[PDB]
Amino acid sequence: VRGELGVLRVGFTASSAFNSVVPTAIRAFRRAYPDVRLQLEEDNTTRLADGLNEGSLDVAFLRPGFAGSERFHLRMLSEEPMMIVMAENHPAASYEEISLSAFRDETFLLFPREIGLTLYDSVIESCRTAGFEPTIGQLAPQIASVINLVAAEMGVSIVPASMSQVKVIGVVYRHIADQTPTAKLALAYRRGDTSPVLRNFVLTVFP
Amino acid sequence: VRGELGVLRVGFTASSAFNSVVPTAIRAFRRAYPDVRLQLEEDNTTRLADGLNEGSLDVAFLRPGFAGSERFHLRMLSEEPMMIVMAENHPAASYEEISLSAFRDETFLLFPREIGLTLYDSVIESCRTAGFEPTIGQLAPQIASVINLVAAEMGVSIVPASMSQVKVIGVVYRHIADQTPTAKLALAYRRGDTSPVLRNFVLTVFP
Numbered sequence A, B: 001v002r003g004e005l006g007v008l009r010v011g012f013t014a015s016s017a018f019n020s021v022v023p024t025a026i027r028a029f030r031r032a033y034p035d036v037r038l039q040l041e042e043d044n045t046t047r048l049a050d051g052l053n054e055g056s057l058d059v060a061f062l063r064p065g066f067a068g069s070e071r072f073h074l075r076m077l078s079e080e081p082m083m084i085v086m087a088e089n090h091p092a093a094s095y096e097e098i099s100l101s102a103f104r105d106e107t108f109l110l111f112p113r114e115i116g117l118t119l120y121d122s123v124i125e126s127c128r129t130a131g132f133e134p135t136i137g138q139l140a141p142q143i144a145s146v147i148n149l150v151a152a153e154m155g156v157s158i159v160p161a162s163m164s165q166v167k168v169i170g171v172v173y174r175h176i177a178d179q180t181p182t183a184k185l186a187l188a189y190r191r192g193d194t195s196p197v198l199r200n201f202v203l204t205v206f207p
C-alpha cells in the first residue's frame, strides 16, 4: 500500500484543462488516493518541461515534441483536431466548408511561440500546408486570451477542438476541411523516478 | 501628437479577459494608436499590482481593493454579478431559484487565495452572508481550471457572470437569488506616471 500519502505536483497547460482527459484523470486519482495532496500548476509546455527537469513538478499534461523530450517519459493521452476560431461576422463564417486558403491574407492571432513551440509551429505548418505564410497580428498570453481578442475582430486563430467549449459571445468555431496536424496531449514524467505516488498516478491515468 | 510611439505593457487577469471591456479597450487602443506596441500579460491581481509597482507593467485590468491599492489610480470599468457554477447533474441544477444555503454542506472549488485576495474573500463573504462557512476542496490555478474540475463533479464554485461563456460540457451556470457582492474590474496605473502613451491609453478606455 505504498504511495498513498504525500504531495504530487501536477502541471497542465491552460488549454489542456478543457480537454476532458485532464479533469477525468485528476478526479480518478483523487478518488483512488484521497490522502495524496494534488498541488496543481497551470503553465505552458516550456515551463512544465522545465519544472519536471528541475523537480518542481512530478508529472505534467503537456504537448509532446519539445526539444529534449526524449529525456522524459511521454505517454499520449489525447489527440484532437484543430479548428478555426473567428468573429461571428467574419465573411468565412457563413461558408459551407472552411479551407485555410480563405485566410491567406487574414490576420492570425496567436500566443507567444516561446511558451509552446510545438503547438505554435503546428499552426504555422497548417497554413503552410494550405499554401501560405500567415500574417501574425497581436499576440495574447494564452489561447483563451486569443479567443477573447478574436471576439473583438482582431483576427482569426487555430485552436484545439476542445477550446470550442469557450463560447465567448461573438465568436464561432469551424472545422477545417484541409488536412491539419492534431493538437496533442501527453502525460510526462521523469525517467527513473521510481516514486510510488507518481507510479500510482500514472497507473490511474492509464488503467 | 505625443505618445503615438513606444511600448505599453498591459496586464489583465485570466478571467477578466472574458469581460467584454478588456477586448473592447484593447481593440479601441490598437485602432487609435496603431504604432504603439501592446505587450500583453495575463496574471492575477497580486502579480499585476506588483508589476505596476516595480514598473514591469504600465497599466492593468485588475480587481480593486487590494492592500496598498491607494498608491495607484483605480478607475472602475465593470461590475458584474457572480453566479454559481455546478455540474449539470448536481441536485440544485433543477431548482427554479438558487440560494447559497443549498450548498452549506457542499464542497466549493476555488483558486489559491494569495493570487487574488479580494475576489477569493468575496466568495467566502457570499457564503457567510448566506449563513455558512464554505468547505473548500481542491484548489485549481485559475477560474477556468476550477470550472473544468466542476465538470468532473469535484464541487461547485462562484464565478464572475462573464465566465458563463465558458461552456465546458457538463457544467451549468445559475444566478444567485441571494445578495452577493459584485465581481469588480478596474483599470489601474501608477500615480504621477505622466507618460503620454499611458495617458492616451487611459483616455481611450474612458472617452
Ligand SMILES: C=C(CC(=O)O)C(=O)O
Pocket: A013, A014, A015, A016, A043, A044, A045, A046, A062, A063, A111, A115, A116, A117, A119, A120, A142, A143
Ligand atoms: C498555449 C499552449 C501551448 C503549450 O503550452 O504547449 C497551450 O495552452 O497548450
Ligand SMILES: C=C(CC(=O)O)C(=O)O
Pocket: B013, B014, B015, B016, B043, B044, B045, B046, B062, B063, B111, B115, B116, B117, B119, B120, B142, B143
Ligand atoms: C482569479 C482571479 C482573481 C484575481 O486575479 O484578482 C481572476 O481571474 O480575476
Ligand SMILES: [Cl-]
Pocket: A073, A074
Ligand atoms: Cl519510453
Ligand SMILES: [Cl-]
Pocket: B073, B074
Ligand atoms: Cl484618484
